[PDB]
Amino acid sequence: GKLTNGALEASNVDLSKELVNMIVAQRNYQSNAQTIKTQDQILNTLVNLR
Amino acid sequence: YSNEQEQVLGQIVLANFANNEGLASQGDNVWAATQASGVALLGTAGSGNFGKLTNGALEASNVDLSKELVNMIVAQRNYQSNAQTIKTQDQILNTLVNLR
Amino acid sequence: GKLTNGALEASNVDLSKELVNMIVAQRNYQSNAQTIKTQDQILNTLVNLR
Amino acid sequence: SFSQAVSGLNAAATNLDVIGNNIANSATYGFKSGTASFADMFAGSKVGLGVKVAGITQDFTDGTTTNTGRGLDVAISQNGFFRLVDSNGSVFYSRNGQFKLDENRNLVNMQGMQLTGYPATGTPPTIQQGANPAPITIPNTLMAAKSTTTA
Amino acid sequence: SFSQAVSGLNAAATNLDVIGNNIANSATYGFKSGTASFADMFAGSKVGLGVKVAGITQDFTDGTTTNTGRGLDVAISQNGFFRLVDSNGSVFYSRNGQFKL
Amino acid sequence: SFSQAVSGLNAAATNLDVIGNNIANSATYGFKSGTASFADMFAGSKVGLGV
């Protein structure tokens, strides 16, 4: 490509889409957390029903 | 390229199975052909029953969390019901053993 | 119908009514969620009262 | 007769983990949701014995398309799998639309498996549809000049 | 069988931080957005075991050009990296258009 | 099912910037106004997927 002076490239990160990504990811994250809790609760149940 | 043209480099081949549905899950997101799947049929995008290959996109998982969380909660209750069934039998057996 | 040039049809979606639909639907959604929780709580109650 | 409860218990455990994987892998690409069937066990009695066995399945519905633009992000609609070849000479199938050119001028996933297709031949190249699904490569070498033949 | 949830949990954590770095480093120069692929783990069962592993990638799309004028602010379009050499005799590549004497 | 909203959100963002460039570059010479078409995404459902 060309090497024009008078300019810097600057990051190609788009915050209007990254914030969205983040929020969605957080929900996904929590879904995983419940999966673990679910299993934990269950195991505890089993252990104590005996 | 610089010679003012487009040339063919190759053609991506697409595969359909008899059953698609029946494939053996592997690796990362890889499937092995199986007898259940039958033998793959090869073709090109837009031909026969082979879908299109638009660029500019990834398919992404078809999992719907709004329904999976529900499934999970219900399943947990079901699970516990089974647990009580066992406990019930255990308690009973212990009862029997000790009533003598 | 007629085929006048000089124009595109554009979507027939009315945002002044869709936003309303959405808000109402959300409340309805939550009502269903409580129904499930209700049943879950109850079942858990039953299981543990023994 | 604990088996008539234990069987079920185990089946339920399996179910939960299948769900767990759907949830976790919901952030993956091309992943198709998994599930499982269940069936009644053993006869020789009016009462089912053992009780339950599980059969896991996977439902290949289409996903979405996701407004991407880097690499060779090729999505696929409806049925169809990309035909991949493992470096050890093994054929695999995948809907993993993420493709990139490696240092050998080969199209691969990540994974790392080779994307195959029909070979091109002639000048300009033509697609041998009747040929075997050769590995797709993209040379960075020069188009030779071609004399005028007609005008 | 906690691993079938934990794996995913960890993958999600990684994803979040990748996003976090894109956000933070959005104010940097020549920075290319990062992301990650994910893949299904272990067979030996109809049910995936372990479940998920992550593979980080970086998408080198062009940025913008930014009306600067001090130093040797050389931007670059399309592909291309500036070839840099570390004082210890090591070769590196960069799109860092900021140069000074 | 966030994709059915996110897709649209992104499309809207693009639209805004296209407009933004028309406005900014209104002071340029020979510049022709830009715009964009939009289309419905993915089937396999009665409900549009992706969008």
Residue numbers in the entry:
A (entry chain A), C (entry chain A): 353 to 402
B (entry chain A): 303 to 402
D (entry chain A): 1 to 151
E (entry chain A): 1 to 101
F (entry chain A): 1 to 51
Give sentences from the paper.
The bacterial flagellum can be divided into three main parts: the transmembrane basal body that acts as a rotary motor as well as the flagellar protein export machine to construct the flagellar axial structures; the long filament extending into the cell exterior to function as a helical propeller; and the hook connecting the motor and filament as a universal joint to transmit motor torque to the filament. The Salmonella hook is a short, highly curved tubular structure built by helical assembly of about 120 copies of a single protein, FlgE. The length of the hook is regulated to 55 nm ± 7 nm, and its highly curved structure and bending flexibility make it work as a universal joint, transmitting motor torque to the filament regardless of the filament orientation off-axis of the motor during run and tumble of the cell for taxis. The FlgE molecule consists of three major domains, D0, D1 and D2, that are arranged radially from the inner core to the outer surface of the tubular structure and axially from the proximal to the distal end of the hook.
We carried out the structural analysis of the flagellar hook isolated from Salmonella in the straight form by cryoEM helical image analysis and built an atomic model based on the 4.1 Å resolution map. The hook was purified from a fliK-deficient mutant strain of Salmonella, SJW880, which produces polyhooks that are structurally identical to the native hook but can grow as long as 1 µm. The final resolution of the three-dimensional image reconstruction was 4.1 Å by the criteria of a Fourier shell correlation of 0.143. In the previous model built based on a cryoEM density map, the model of domain D0 was not so accurate and that of domain Dc was missing due to limited resolution of the density map. The model of Salmonella FlgE is now complete with the full-length chain connected from the N- to the C-terminus as shown in Figure 2 in two different views. Domain D0 consists of the N- and C-terminal α-helices (Ser 1–Ala 27 and Leu 367–Arg 402, respectively) forming an antiparallel coiled coil, with the C-terminal helix facing the central channel and tilted from the hook axis by about 17°. Domain Dc is a long β-hairpin (Lys 32–Phe 60) running parallel with the N-terminal helix and with its length nearly the same as that of the N-terminal helix. Thus, domains D0 and Dc together form a compact domain, which we hereafter call domain D0-Dc. In contrast, the Dc domains (green) have close interactions in the −5-start and 11-start helical lines, making a stable tubular structure, albeit the 6-start interactions are absent. Thus, the tubular structure of the hook is stabilized and maintained mainly by the intersubunit interactions of D0-Dc domains alone in the inner core of the hook structure. Residues 38–40 in the middle of the β-hairpin of domain Dc of subunit 0 are closely interacting with the tip loop (residues 328–331) of a short β-hairpin of domain D1 of subunit −5.
